[PDB]
Design an enzyme around this catalytic site. Structure first.
Site, mmCIF file in Angstrom:
data_model
loop_
_atom_site.group_PDB
_atom_site.id
_atom_site.type_symbol
_atom_site.label_atom_id
_atom_site.label_comp_id
_atom_site.label_asym_id
_atom_site.label_seq_id
_atom_site.Cartn_x
_atom_site.Cartn_y
_atom_site.Cartn_z
ATOM 1 N N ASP A 173 1.610 -6.859 -11.342
ATOM 2 C CA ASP A 173 0.410 -6.614 -10.626
ATOM 3 C C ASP A 173 -0.548 -7.603 -10.786
ATOM 4 O O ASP A 173 -0.475 -8.759 -11.640
ATOM 5 C CB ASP A 173 -0.325 -5.411 -11.388
ATOM 6 N N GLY A 174 -1.639 -7.735 -9.823
ATOM 7 C CA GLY A 174 -2.796 -8.707 -9.924
ATOM 8 C C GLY A 174 -2.716 -9.731 -9.147
ATOM 9 O O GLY A 174 -3.520 -10.603 -9.306
ATOM 10 N N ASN A 175 -1.768 -9.789 -8.064
ATOM 11 C CA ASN A 175 -1.607 -11.045 -7.410
ATOM 12 C C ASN A 175 -2.798 -11.353 -6.450
ATOM 13 O O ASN A 175 -3.486 -12.485 -6.419
ATOM 14 C CB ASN A 175 -0.344 -10.827 -6.306
ATOM 15 N N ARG A 223 -6.012 -10.003 -6.917
ATOM 16 C CA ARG A 223 -7.203 -10.538 -8.023
ATOM 17 C C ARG A 223 -7.110 -11.887 -8.343
ATOM 18 O O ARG A 223 -8.229 -12.404 -8.603
ATOM 19 C CB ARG A 223 -7.093 -9.256 -8.980
ATOM 20 N N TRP A 224 -5.825 -12.309 -8.841
ATOM 21 C CA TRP A 224 -5.861 -13.561 -9.227
ATOM 22 C C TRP A 224 -6.410 -14.501 -8.014
ATOM 23 O O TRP A 224 -6.879 -15.662 -8.288
ATOM 24 C CB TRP A 224 -4.342 -14.018 -9.534
ATOM 25 N N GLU A 280 3.799 2.372 -1.817
ATOM 26 C CA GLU A 280 2.029 2.214 -1.761
ATOM 27 C C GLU A 280 1.899 1.042 -1.118
ATOM 28 O O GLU A 280 0.965 1.097 -0.036
ATOM 29 C CB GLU A 280 1.643 2.191 -3.037
ATOM 30 N N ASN A 281 2.595 -0.091 -1.104
ATOM 31 C CA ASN A 281 2.087 -1.356 -0.696
ATOM 32 C C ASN A 281 2.396 -1.432 0.926
ATOM 33 O O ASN A 281 1.895 -2.265 1.428
ATOM 34 C CB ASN A 281 3.069 -2.530 -1.240
#
Ligand code: FPP
Lengths: 228, 228
Positions: A12-14, A16-17, A60-61
């Site tokens: 997770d977090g790609n 946001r990063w 979901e993606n």
């Protein structure tokens, strides 16, 4: 013993990063995440981990903006081709439904994965077009189909479903369940990833977004796992 | 207040708590834990939580010493009789297989739970003789038996299973899935507890052993959940 046989990673977090780093194109995040997948798998192999599962694409993606989804799927395809590189001699398996990602990507992924050996010291599962409840449903469907093909009556189909029968018909058929599940981005959930299989898995969490995941974070995960 | 609709609690650490506190007889931990279950449920009710599920006995727990298991089962029976007290006016449901705990305790538990109202402001699930993979198997069996009863052919059964069908046939049929799952004693696993249902649940952990769990910790859990 103190070491996981099978480690599973939710990356997770790609996006946001990428935003935190000031990029307007979130694909910069996915590209760095892709680099970290390559690194992580090398770390697992060298640590003596037998099997690693990486969560590349959830169902979901797939609901995302077509154009962003397309670029993501291209990055994922590059990732898998890299994982399947001959010099690695890793045994690779797809976990999920390639019927969901487009035919050209599916052909590229299948071809890459099929080129890898069945027998190897290190195994990688790439989870693409995956959902855990869906996997269970599809396992049960496969199980019932086999029974019918072998002459089961409707009444016998009603009794054929067992814990072991479901296990044997998952994408991960014949593999050890995950001992350790790593999630990033401070996200303290499973999101159905390897839902059936991870019923008894140790969970380990970091606040770091996936592209920011470091070898020392991996060392901490293994240290904590051993301590437990 | 962003409250969980459904909180699920794995009450771990009872015997470790007792040993740490210098009690030679670790059954005593279960008695302190039982007292804390009643208090937690009070806190949930007062806070406006609609449904709480407490994990009282796993299929694995039945593998313990007879004297210890005997005490534990009597303690669980007491816990449930308290939860079902008419003065609470709580709606109670058993989640699991009472055939696993012996005829006389099973009789007492069922009598207590049956005595509670169907409609109430606060609902409690007591998980006794429960395993998550088994629950899914039994849900699938129930689903298929209903399809056969409605006249489905064997061919049709093979493709009758759906995500919604499984959810509607679990012990928790008609209830919302858990929003928050709490585990104590620093244990970071789900152990198959509400396996299907908790696919998307927030997990929250404390180092405190269950008998040491306090209202301030409960408020921390709600605060942390609200902040997720
Ligand atoms: C009255 C009272 C306080 C009752 C509670 C006592 C009790 C048996 C609590 C166990 C709850 C729990 C975390 C079960 C899961 O362990 P597991 O053994 O099924 O699975 P695991 O090996 O992964 O932990």
């Amino acid at each position: 013993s103190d070491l996981p046989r099978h480690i599973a990673v939710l990356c997770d977090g790609n996006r946001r990063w990428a935003r935190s780093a000031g990029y307007d194109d979130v694909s910069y995040g996915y590209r760095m995440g892709a680099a970290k997948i390559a690194e992580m798998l090398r770390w697992c192999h060298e640590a003596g981990i037998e099997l690693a599962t990486v969560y590349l694409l959830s169902t979901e993606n797939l609901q995302r903006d077509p154009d962003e989804l397309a670029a993501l799927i291209e990055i994922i395809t590059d990732v898998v081709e890299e994982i399947c590189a001959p010099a690695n001699h890793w045994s690779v398996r797809t976990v999920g439904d390639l019927g969901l990602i487009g035919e050209e990507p599916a052909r590229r992924l299948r071809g890459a994965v099929e080129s890898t050996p069945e027998v190897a010291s290190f195994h990688v599962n790439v989870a693409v077009g995956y959902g855990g409840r869906r996997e269970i449903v599809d396992a049960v469907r496969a199980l019932l189909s086999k029974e019918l093909a072998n002459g089961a009556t409707a009444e016998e189909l009603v009794d054929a479903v067992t814990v072991e029968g479901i296990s044997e018909n998952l994408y991960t058929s014949g593999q050890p369940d995950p001992d350790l599940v790593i999630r990033t981005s401070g996200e303290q959930r499973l999101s159905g990833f390897l839902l059936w299989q991870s019923a008894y898995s140790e969970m380990w969490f970091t606040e770091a977004h996936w592209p920011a995941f470091r070898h020392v974070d991996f060392l901490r995960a293994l240290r904590d796992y051993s301590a437990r």
